[PDB]
């Protein structure tokens, strides 16, 4: 199951200074970037165009240009008309895309100063529980605009799913790649035993500290950390007693090994 994600990052320091940057993710892989500086969206992958034609894409490319500039002037209008409820600096984040089933569900979420305030749903924008009361009139206005409502609707209902199914076909060679993890052991006075695992793709990996048949229930699994080359890094730990570290092992299971589990003895 894959989640397509267009993330938009917009900053407003004052009147005059503003910048909108954006990145597009299919699952855990980047497909697009769009800096404030660039006129066109850039492809990060060779397949980021999916199965859209050149015209298909160029028309879509324009619509976002017309959006990015409009999104800025509008937000800065919304602050000029506001006050003193709102003032600079202002941060806006926007997350939109669609999840994939064997069937889909699209989404649009807006967050203002870090807190999630607005989502688009069905045929209309709506404020989300706890969001600032002053957003109501603004959202009402935004919904009396049919053209915008309609473009957002068409992008969410029609394009996102179509666009995504193309990428899933196009990037098959990159999404189904298999990368083997190399692993090493270290220790550090808390004594603590760290099991490093690096370079694996895709993301699901099984790492555990062992004493024979027995998985040590005391294993602390870290957070997945990104490598520079689109592989993953992970660590596992286990606090040990004085003599207890002699006889322990680190076992690593991954899809890239295929039965060939990595077992490191301390």
């Amino acid at each position: 199951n894959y989640t397509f994600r267009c993330l938009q990052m917009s900053s407003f320091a004052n009147r005059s200074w503003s910048r909108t940057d954006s990145v597009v993710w299919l699952g855990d892989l980047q497909t697009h970037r769009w800096s404030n500086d660039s006129a066109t969206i850039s492809f990060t992958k060779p397949w980021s165009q999916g199965k859209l034609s050149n015209q298909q894409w160029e028309k879509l490319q324009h619509m976002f240009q017309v959006y990015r500039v409009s999104f800025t002037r509008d937000i800065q209008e919304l602050v000029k008309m506001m006050s003193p409820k709102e003032d600079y600096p202002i941060e806006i984040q926007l997350s939109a895309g669609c999840e994939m089933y064997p069937a889909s569900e699209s989404f649009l979420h807006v967050a203002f100063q870090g807190k999630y305030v607005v989502r688009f749903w069905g045929t209309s924008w709506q404020t989300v529980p706890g969001a600032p009361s002053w957003l109501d009139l603004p959202i009402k206005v935004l919904n009396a605009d049919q053209g915008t409502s309609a473009t957002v609707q068409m992008l969410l209902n029609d394009t996102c799913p179509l666009f995504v199914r193309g990428l899933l076909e196009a990037g098959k060679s990159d999404l189904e790649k298999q990368e083997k993890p190399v692993a090493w052991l270290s220790s550090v006075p808390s004594r603590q035993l760290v099991c490093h695992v690096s370079g694996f793709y895709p993301k699901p990996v099984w790492v555990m500290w062992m004493r024979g048949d027995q998985e040590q229930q005391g294993t602390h699994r870290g957070d997945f950390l990104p490598n520079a080359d689109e592989t993953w890094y992970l660590q596992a730990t286990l606090d040990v007693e004085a003599g207890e570290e002699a006889g322990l092992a680190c076992r690593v299971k991954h899809s890239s090994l295929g039965g060939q589990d990595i077992i490191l003895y301390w």
Epitope: K59, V66, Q146, G147, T148, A150, T151, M154
Partner: T-cell receptor, first 111, second 113 residues
Framework: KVQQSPESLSVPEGGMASLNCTSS?????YFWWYRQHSGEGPKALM?????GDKKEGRFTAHLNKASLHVSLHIRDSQPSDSALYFC?????????????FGLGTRVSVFP | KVLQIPSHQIIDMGQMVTLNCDPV?????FYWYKQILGQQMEFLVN????????KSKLFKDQFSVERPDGSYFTLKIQPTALEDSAVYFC????????????FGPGTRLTVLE
């Protein structure tokens, strides 16, 4: 091609003019109604693209994407309603488009 | 309001005609529409930012649509069949699709022998 009905309708002041429109391509289930008076620029009356009804004041419109069939209902017909009503289908997934109208319907409201 | 001027123009065959259009500010999607004897509305061209996009079959080989910065949006018939005598409408959109197109009052062209 988008086929309209009829060639011409004739409604009495107060009655309701009802028109039809059908798309033949499954990728054109997003419709517009544009009204134009004599020697004058067309104005957009209303959009649909959604399976329901849509009441825009004195105007109601029903769409069924299922059979690509639309209807426009001009209830409480004004004298100032007598005009050429056009209907066009827009393409699914385009984002840069010409409104491509059918043959249009001349409505004559009379007192 | 999308403005067209003028409005009622009579031209003799063989000499080029300029049809000026002054679209609504903030819009960047332009259109030309032809209606002869007042019957059928016909799409010709759509323009965006700096270049044309969809040119229809009705867009003759003798036609040209420019939009320099500061000036109007101009269709130029050059030149100039007796079949051109019709009404042409300019239009603005803001959104590329799925949103209202605004039509001008049109220019009545009359090419004559």
């Amino acid at each position: 091609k988008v086929q309209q009905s009829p060639e011409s309708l004739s409604v009495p002041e107060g009655g309701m003019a009802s028109l039809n429109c059908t798309s033949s391509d499954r990728n054109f289930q997003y419709f517009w109604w544009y009204r134009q008076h004599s020697g004058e620029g067309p104005k957009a009356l209303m959009s649909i693209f959604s399976d329901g009804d849509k009441k825009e004041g004195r105007f109601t419109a029903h769409l069924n994407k299922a059979s690509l069939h639309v209807s426009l209902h001009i209830r409480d017909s004004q004298p100032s309603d007598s005009a050429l009503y056009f209907c066009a289908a827009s393409e699914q997934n385009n984002y840069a488009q010409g409104l491509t109208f059918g043959l249009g319907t001349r409505v004559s409201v009379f007192p | 309001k999308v403005l067209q001027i003028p409005s009622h123009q009579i031209i003799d065959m063989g000499q080029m005609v300029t049809l000026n259009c002054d679209p609504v500010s903030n819009h960047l999607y332009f259109y030309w529409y032809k209606q002869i004897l007042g019957q059928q509305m016909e799409f010709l061209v759509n323009f965006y930012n700096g270049k044309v996009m969809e040119k229809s079959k009705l867009f003759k080989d003798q036609f040209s649509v420019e939009r320099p910065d500061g000036s109007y949006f101009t269709l130029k018939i050059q030149p100039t069949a007796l079949e051109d005598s019709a009404v042409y409408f300019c239009a603005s959109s803001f959104w590329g699709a799925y949103a209202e197109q605004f039509f001008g009052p049109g220019t009545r062209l009359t090419v004559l022998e």
